[PDB]
Amino acid sequence: KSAAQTEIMLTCTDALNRNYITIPRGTRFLAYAKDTSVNPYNFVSREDVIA
Amino acid sequence: PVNYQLTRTANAIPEIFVGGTFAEIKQNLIEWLNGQNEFLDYDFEGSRLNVLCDLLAYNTLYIQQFGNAAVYESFMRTANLRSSVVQAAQDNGYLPTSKSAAQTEIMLTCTDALNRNYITIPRGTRFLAYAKDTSVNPYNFVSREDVIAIRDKNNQYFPRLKLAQGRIVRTEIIYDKLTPIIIYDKNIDRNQVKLYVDGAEWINWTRKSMVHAGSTSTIYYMRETIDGNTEFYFGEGEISANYIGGLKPTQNSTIVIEYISTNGADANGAVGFSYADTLTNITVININENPNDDPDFVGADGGGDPEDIERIRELGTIKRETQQRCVTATDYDTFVSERFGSIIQAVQTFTDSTKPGYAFIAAKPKSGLYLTTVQREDIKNYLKDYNLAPITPSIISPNYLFIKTNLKVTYALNKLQESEQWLEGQIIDKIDRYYTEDVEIFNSSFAKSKMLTYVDDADHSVIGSSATIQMVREVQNFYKTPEAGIKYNNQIKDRSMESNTFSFNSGRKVVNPDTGLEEDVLYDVRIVSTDRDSKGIGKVIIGPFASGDVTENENIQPYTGNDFNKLANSDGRDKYYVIGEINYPADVIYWNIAKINLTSEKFEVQTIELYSDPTDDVIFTRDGSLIVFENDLRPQYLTIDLEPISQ
């Protein structure tokens, strides 16, 4: 079987202002994968990165 | 050496004990079993009469440990296993301070509604303190002693007292004389205990607050009985005292022990205290001054936790050199120690020849820097009772040489977990651990390479490190410097010894906008040690000057040139005034601002840093001057850069 994959660029920010914020493995997202609207599926980053 | 008769040896476990590697035991047994005795008639077999030899060798190598260990912990210097160590240190009159509690002196401003004179403030008077790490939760405090106050002028009291950490607990017991009275709890500083027997008093023996010359019986004893639980007991006396000994109870009594719970060393923070006082008309007016004494204050001190094994030993044997009395420089070092210790990291007492009497004691608290007072006066009294009568002890504190790092650890972003902050602080204590272990003590130097190897030991991701360095030594009185004092002990690397800040006052008026005027408190100054010259020379300068205030006369004519003597950055109009000597090869600094003849009132607060950078990498020490870095108290110089690497 196989799973969908994209690359999204998150614009987010932190209150602590600390440099080199991380974004760990799972970071659950959810996506409609549109047929009309209703219901999401799920998403997980699964790797690391850095900002 | 020269003559071979001087070889001798240090403490040496003889070859008699040592103990087996196994197979060497197999060798010696076979030679004793097969040889010199039997020439085997054995009925087992060719192999069995062989094989069965090591079957009893495992019996040896076993009994050569299980029973042979006893002689290791029988003696002191060679023993391991605390229990034996401690238990064998009381017959040397020591005891190892199982734990400790924080102590301060606060002055309560409170007052009463009855206005009655001589208000009291009894033993417990529960307080509570955050001992700040952030804010949340208190610990506890109890005064534990007495005091008194006095009403003067306006109706108020100043019942300044001292206080310990924990709460208290009292367990009364009937003495069976067959029943080794004990405690069992993991606590109870042996420094502060009461233990009445049904009347009062019972000042015991092992630790005196008075020594009460004569006084005969009523003493008791406190030791160990291993296990962590303290033993109390009484002497052999009779009192039908008989001759000499402890009074002993009589077959039935109420024995009231009271100790302090001593939460632990976590309480070093102190700072803000609250009343929590319910007694009588005393209002608990607050305005509580934690440090009303003297200069910079860390909060409480002490807190203990049990002493390490490597500590006890060194202090365990040396107390045979003394007997409960200090006649010697090395004695004060043992009397300023776990008895009064946990408030003092290192001592090195010495006597100055020019000034008779007056045994001088340098001390560094674990809190860092200065002992303040009443923690000093406390060290005063506990000595002078055991001291050599005419001479008075005094606490000078050492002459501190700190060092300014400015180091960069250059980690890698890939392998971290907690990233910055937590690593920013994880590098602190590792550096701090380097000082506490090697260079915390006297006569020991430090090498920045050894600091970096604890730096690179932070966790993993840190790879490489490096630092500049400057030796900082801060003058106290300033304005002068002592006679032939203020010395680094190291080569100074000329074109160094850079100023601090300073300031000026006076300079006519120079009114400003807004409000009426000002005193012209701006326009600071600062000192520079210039160059070297034909041999030492080098002079030094007080700093930038515009014009006006000075006495020029014929003896000043301010100038070193536009040569070295680097410039302070301001308008400042140069014209640096020559002040003092600073001979480079034998390290000496000399100032005496009176040379240019200014007024001390024109200067702001004294106690200014100077901090030249060293020539050689390694910084030495002598003459009872420590190099110890303490961060938490003075952050002023520590600067580190985490500049990262992405692979």
From Swiss-Prot, chain A:
Domain of life: Viruses
Coiled-coil portions: none
Expression induction: Expressed in the late phase of the viral replicative cycle.
Subcellular location: Virion
Family to which the UniProt record says this protein belongs: Belongs to the T4likevirus baseplate wedge protein gp6 family.
Job of this protein: Baseplate protein that is located next to the tail tube (inner baseplate). Involved in the tail assembly. The gp25-(gp6)2-gp7 module is involved in sheath contraction.
Subunit description: Homodimer; each gp6 molecule in the ring interacts with its two neighbors, forming an N-terminal dimer with one and a C-terminal dimer with the other. Heterotrimer with gp7; gp6 is part of a (gp6)2-gp7 heterotrimeric molecule. The (gp6)2-gp7 heterotrimeric molecule further interacts with gp25 and gp53; the gp25-(gp6)2-gp7 module is involved in sheath contraction.
Protein name, entry field: Baseplate wedge protein gp6
Gene label: 6
Shown residues within the full chain: 103 to 153 of 660
